Design a protein around this nucleic acid. Structure first.
Length: 212
DNA sequence: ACACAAAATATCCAGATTGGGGACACGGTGATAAACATGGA
């Protein structure tokens, strides 16, 4: 129905299972977008549990919505190499096995990278109740978001759309994730996405319906 | 203490000359360290 714009000076979207060296994507993943939308709604996550894993999210009940992503200006990236919180991968021993109070004791720096600027025009098709809840949360009683204001109708920009095995893409993102829980599952099938540069509204294929 | 008148025409430099000779650095060195990940019985 109605959509909104946002911007931020710095951002970072680390792909999962990156390993030692971290990376990022020019466009935030769908799951991160959904998490941001849920956080702004003022509704907490369905899971309240603590342990080895803390993403136990059954899909039994969750508001339905369709999400599109826009991009107005390409952004470069930079890298910083300071420190990282290592997880032991070797038998190791000594001091780590002595104290053992949330130890994470071994430390070794490698790398990581961040973005230079972010400005997106996010598109949402949601029921009226969810939009009203968002309005109440924004107006009522990690350097990721700076400010938000709905300027839907003006300020056109490019969009993204999945591509079928034909022709060739340009300036396309590497990987994208729809739904994921950090345990044994099938992850997501569709990975490749490409942008299209045209002024008017995105096509019907651009909108993607999230299972959650 | 009254009135009247308060300059006019010619001319305002000419030559010769504006540097020459020698030299523009020599040696010695150009970081050194610590911070593991997988296999077979």
């Amino acid at each position: 129905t109605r959509y909104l714009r946002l911007k931020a000076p710095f951002a970072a979207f680390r792909p999962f299972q990156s390993g030692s060296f971290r990376s990022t994507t020019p466009v935030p993943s769908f799951s991160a977008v959904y998490g941001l939308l849920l956080n702004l709604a003022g509704i907490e996550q369905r899971q309240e549990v603590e342990g080895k894993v803390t993403l136990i999210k059954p899909k039994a009940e969750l508001p339905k919505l369709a999400i599109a992503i826009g991009q107005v200006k390409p952004s470069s990236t930079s890298l910083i190499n300071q420190q990282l919180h290592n997880y032991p991968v070797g038998n190791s021993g000594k001091e780590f096995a002595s104290r053992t109070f949330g130890s994470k004791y071994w430390i070794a720096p490698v790398r990581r990278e961040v973005l230079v600027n972010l400005d997106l025009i996010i598109g949402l098709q949601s029921p009226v109740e969810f939009w009203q809840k968002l309005d109440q949360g924004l107006k009522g009683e990690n350097f990721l978001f700076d400010e938000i204001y709905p300027i839907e109708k003006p300020d056109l920009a490019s969009w993204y759309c999945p591509l079928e095995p034909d022709t060739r893409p340009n300036q396309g993102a590497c990987r994208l994730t729809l739904w994921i829980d950090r345990e044994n599952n099938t992850q997501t099938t569709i990975k490749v996405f490409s942008p299209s540069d045209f002024r008017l509204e995105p096509p019907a294929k651009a909108w993607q319906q999230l299972p959650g």
